[PDB]
């Protein structure tokens, strides 16, 4: 369990597979998600399989399938700021300690 | 030397105390409790200043008028003198008039 | 009791300041203090003076033999500086003689030898090395570092620089950090001699020039406690020097010293060193 | 003097006129500034920490 | 005493850290120290201007001494070094008179040459060839 | 004033400009708390300006201690043994950057 996420290279064909299974036509980027049941089923399957759930704040922002696609292909990574700086290729005169 | 030599023993503050965690509750009991009670029926204190603010003269006048029948004799005399002084002060002393 | 916390805290810090001034702690070495990493600081010492070092050679150039003896003594409860130290001292003495002979050609060998001895002596090397973070990086037994150990580590640093990046770069290092210590300092503050009159007479016979005559040119208050005797040193009725003094003997001594300075090229008005 | 009296009249009155139109527009355009959400949320940033 | 002052030792010590070198009870008692330290800061602020004035007076005294040593006077030296477009100030002239006396003798000779050329120019009035040192260099 | 204060003559460390110029600053020691508003700007300094500052001048060793401090500190140690400890309490990134460049430039 972590918010560490990397978007898979086959996010697309997985996501055509899931939108096919929940329902269909061409131009499927423009499928409306105004119905609550279909959007619930889609996002529940995506969160169950990919291990990443849409937060409550971004839940109204996705109205088409294309917003669901643009949400899942951003890398959300997490670590402590010490691991952020220490892996940022420091020049050899920074020594950063973490007394925590 | 008017300063202490040693640091005082530390003030342990429990931010999740019983009063602190449940502070503020039922302050919106009117707007979403069908208006059966006011928030001002929640505050506890003196009888004469439950749900009412004023300056010192209005507070002393209200304290006299509401609970002066059962106040102590020297406390009542002090309050009468205080109301007399504050009446002489708010109405004859000042800069803005 | 005045309630509060910040005033008592500030007073505690001020009392700790007074305690640190009144009975100050013995000077502990910098390596036994917080915020210290030896490798990054050796790299920064390399980059500080604007050249490159081989890091293993510099690490060996900072390790004294007394440190090995001490840590084996503590072990019962590493390469030293040596070959680097004689390498550095040998090349430093040769380069300093080369620099002092190229610019100041008329000087005798004894004077140049004593100038080189002064520039590699304990005083000026321990003054330079304590202002280049050599003592902080020096790994020794005790603190503060004794002057012989500090001089040995400084010449080990010069030797490591030699083996790292060549005689021209090491010559520039010596030029920038040892020749520059001669600035504003006169000759006989550096090469201390006794009886300068005899040295002047010998040097004057070396040029096939007649013996100088001491001759009182100027004077003021001859019988007061504060005289001014200007003894000039003449040769064939043309002076080689003139010098002041409180009495005639010290004035003649100063005239001989001024003649020695003028003959050898240490006038105060000489050409400055070019950098 | 370079000209007589009768020549000076109205020769620079136009500049005085639009100079006062400029200072009048300056006096009649003083009004409270725009308020943004960005400054208030910038104040919300005062508890930003590390992770 | 709901909130009386806890941080009063440090204000007294902020004033008294300036008065530690005074004489008598000014260096100890806060009242006398406040009066003397306010006066001392005022004296510092005015003494910057006084320092400039006294230092220029010192330079003028030194230049007067050296030019009198060469036989001239200070007004002749300045008013005749200005006329050759030698725009040195008194500080440099005074330090030159101390440390480098032959350059000061050259400056004195130059000023005397300009003085004599000015005397020759203002005596024979009319169109005359100007002195060699008397020429000015225009700047456009 | 000047009589209540010690004075010195203008000088350099080891004739600092004759042969070569030597960066007179050795070290710098920020103590930057993970949670605390006082060091908030200092936190952003460590996010933004410290790597560029160190790559601008490699002779200076920079330590970010990141202890749970209350007032953050920059400690500039110099070649002649001097220590100048300065408080970056309640300062923005720009004032901290100018102060750190002030410490780095001077002797
Ligand atoms: Mg003036």
What does this 3D model show about the protein?
It is classed as ribosome. Keywords: 39S mitoribosome, ribosome biogenesis, ribosome. With 100 residues, chain A is mostly helical. Chain A is 41% helix and 3% strand. Chain A starts with 10 loop residues before the first helix and ends with a strand. The longest helix of chain B is centred in the C-terminal third of the chain and has 18 residues. Helices cover 27% and strands 17% of the residues of chain F. Chain F has three helices and four strands. Chain F has a two-stranded parallel ribbon with strand order 1-2. A two-stranded antiparallel sheet of chain F has the order 3-4. Chain F is globular and about 45 Å long. Chains A and C meet through loops of A and α2 of C. β1 of chain A pairs parallel with β2 of chain F, so a sheet runs across the interface. The structure holds magnesium ion.
Put the structure in a nutshell.
It is classed as ribosome. The structure is cut from a larger assembly and holds chains A (100 residues), B (97 residues), C (275 residues), D (51 residues), E (140 residues) and F (107 residues). Chain C is mostly helical.
Offer a few descriptive terms.
part of a larger assembly, 6 chains, E: 140 residues, mainly alpha, 5 helices, rod-shaped, F: 107 residues, alpha+beta, two-stranded parallel ribbon, two-stranded antiparallel sheet, binds magnesium ion, ribosome
Helix-strand blueprint:
The structure is cut from a larger assembly and holds chains A (100 residues), B (97 residues), C (275 residues), D (51 residues), E (140 residues) and F (107 residues).
Chain A: H1 11-22, H2 36-50, H3 65-72, H4 81-86, E1 94-96
Chain B: H1 18-21, H2 56-67, H3 73-90
Helix pairs in contact in B: 2-3
Chain E: H1 9-16, H2 30-69, H3 74-81, H4 90-99, H5 101-123
The structure holds magnesium ion.
Protein name (chain F): Large ribosomal subunit protein mL43
Main location (chain F): mitochondrion
Subcellular location (chain F): Mitochondrion
Structural class of chain B: mainly alpha
The 3D shape of chain B can be described as extended
Number of strands of chain B: 0
What small-molecule ligands were found?
A: magnesium ion
What proportion strand of chain E? under 5%
Fraction in beta strands of chain B: under 5%
Quaternary organization: part of a larger assembly
Calculate the terminal CA-CA distance of chain E, rounded to whole Å.
77 Å
> Largest sheet of chain B at a glance?
none
Rg of chain B, nearest Å: 21 Å
Q: Specify which chain pair forms the largest interface.
A: C-F, 28 and 21 residues
Helicity range of the residues of chain E? 55-70%
Helix fraction bin of chain B: 25-40%
Largest sheet of chain E: none
Q: Count of DSSP helices of chain E?
A: 5
How would the global form of chain E be characterised? rod-shaped
Distance between the termini of chain B: 46 Å
N-to-C series of helices and strands of chain B: HHH
PDB class: ribosome
Keywords: 39S mitoribosome, ribosome biogenesis, ribosome
Entry title: Cryo-EM structure of late human 39S mitoribosome assembly intermediates, state 2
Chain A: 39S ribosomal protein L50, mitochondrial
């Amino acid at each position: 369990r972590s918010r560490a996420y990397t978007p898979p290279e086959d996010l697309q064909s997985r996501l055509e597979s899931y939108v096919k299974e929940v329902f269909l036509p061409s131009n499927w980027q423009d499928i409306s998600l105004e119905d609550s049941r279909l959007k619930f089923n889609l996002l529940a399957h995506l969160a169950d399989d990919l291990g990443h759930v849409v937060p409550n704040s971004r839940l109204h922002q996705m109205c088409r399938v294309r917003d669901v696609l643009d949400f899942y292909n951003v890398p959300i990574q997490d670590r402590s700021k010490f691991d952020e700086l220490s892996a940022s290729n420091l020049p050899p005169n920074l020594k950063i300690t973490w007394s925590y | 030397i008017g300063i202490r030599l040693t640091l005082p023993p530390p003030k342990v503050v429990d931010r999740w105390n019983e009063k602190r965690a449940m502070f503020g509750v039922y302050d919106n009991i009117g707007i979403l409790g069908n208006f059966e009670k006011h928030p001002k029926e929640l505050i506890r204190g003196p009888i004469w200043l439950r749900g009412w603010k004023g300056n010192e003269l209005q507070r002393c006048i209200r304290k006299r008028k509401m609970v002066g029948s059962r106040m102590f004799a020297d406390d009542l005399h002090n309050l009468n003198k205080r109301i007399r002084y504050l009446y002489k002060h708010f109405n004859r002393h000042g800069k803005f008039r | 009791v005045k309630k509060g916390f910040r005033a008592a805290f500030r007073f505690q810090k001020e009392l700790e300041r007074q305690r640190l001034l009144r009975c100050p702690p013995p000077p502990v070495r910098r390596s036994e203090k917080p915020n210290w990493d030896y490798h990054a600081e050796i790299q920064a010492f390399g980059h500080r003076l604007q050249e490159n070092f081989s890091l293993d050679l510099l690490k060996t150039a900072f390790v004294n033999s007394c440190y090995i003896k001490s840590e084996e003594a503590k072990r019962q409860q590493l390469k030293s500086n040596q070959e680097l130290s004689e390498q550095g001292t040998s090349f430093s003495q040769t380069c300093l003689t080369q620099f002092l002979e190229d610019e100041y050609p008329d000087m005798p060998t004894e004077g140049i030898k004593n100038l080189v001895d002064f520039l590699t002596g304990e005083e000026v090397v321990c003054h330079v090395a304590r202002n280049l973070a050599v003592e902080q990086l020096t790994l020794s037994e005790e603190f503060p570092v004794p002057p012989a150990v500090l001089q040995q580590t400084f010449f080990a640093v010069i030797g490591a620089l030699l083996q790292s990046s060549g005689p021209e770069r090491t010559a520039l290092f010596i030029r920038d950090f040892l020749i520059t210590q001669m600035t504003g300092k006169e000759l006989f503050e550096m090469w201390k001699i006794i009886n300068p009159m005899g040295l002047l007479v010998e040097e004057l016979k070396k040029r096939n020039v007649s013996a100088p005559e001491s001759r009182l040119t100027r004077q003021s208050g001859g019988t007061t406690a504060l005289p001014l005797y200007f003894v000039g040193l003449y040769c064939d009725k043309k002076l080689i020097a003139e010098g002041p003094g409180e009495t005639v003997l010290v004035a003649e001594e100063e005239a001989a010293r001024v003649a020695l300075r003028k003959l050898y090229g240490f006038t105060e008005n000489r050409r400055p060193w070019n950098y | 003097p370079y000209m007589t009296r009768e020549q000076e009249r109205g020769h620079a009155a136009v500049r005085r006129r639009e100079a006062f139109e400029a200072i009048k527009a300056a006096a009649t355009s003083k009004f409270p500034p725009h308020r943004f959400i960005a400054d208030q949320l910038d104040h919300l940033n005062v508890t930003k920490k590390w992770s | 005493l709901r909130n009386r002052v806890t941080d009063r030792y440090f204000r007294i010590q902020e004033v008294l850290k300036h008065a530690r070198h005074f004489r008598g009870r000014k260096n100890r008692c806060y009242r006398l120290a406040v009066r003397t330290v306010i006066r001392a800061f005022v004296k510092c602020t005015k003494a910057r201007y006084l320092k400039k004035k006294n230092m220029r007076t010192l330079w003028i005294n030194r230049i007067t001494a050296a030019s009198q040593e060469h036989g001239l006077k200070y007004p002749a030296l300045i008013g005749n070094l200005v006329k050759c477009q030698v725009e040195l100030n008194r500080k440099v002239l005074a330090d030159l008179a101390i440390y480098e006396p032959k350059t000061f003798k050259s400056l004195a000779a130059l000023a005397s040459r300009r003085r004599h050329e000015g005397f020759a120019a203002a005596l024979g009035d009319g169109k005359e060839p100007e002195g060699i040192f008397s020429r000015v260099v225009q700047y456009h | 004033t000047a009589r209540g204060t010690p004075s010195r003559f203008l000088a350099s460390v080891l004739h600092n400009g004759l042969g070569r110029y030597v960066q007179q600053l050795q070290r710098l020691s920020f103590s930057v708390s993970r949670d605390g508003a006082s060091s908030r700007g200092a936190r952003e300094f460590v996010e933004r300006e410290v790597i560029d500052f160190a790559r601008r001048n490699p002779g200076v060793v920079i330590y970010v201690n990141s202890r749970p401090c209350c007032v953050p500190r920059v400690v500039a140690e110099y070649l002649n043994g001097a220590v100048r400890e300065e408080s970056i309490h309640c300062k923005s990134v720009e004032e901290i950057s100018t102060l750190v460049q002030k410490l780095a430039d001077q002797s």
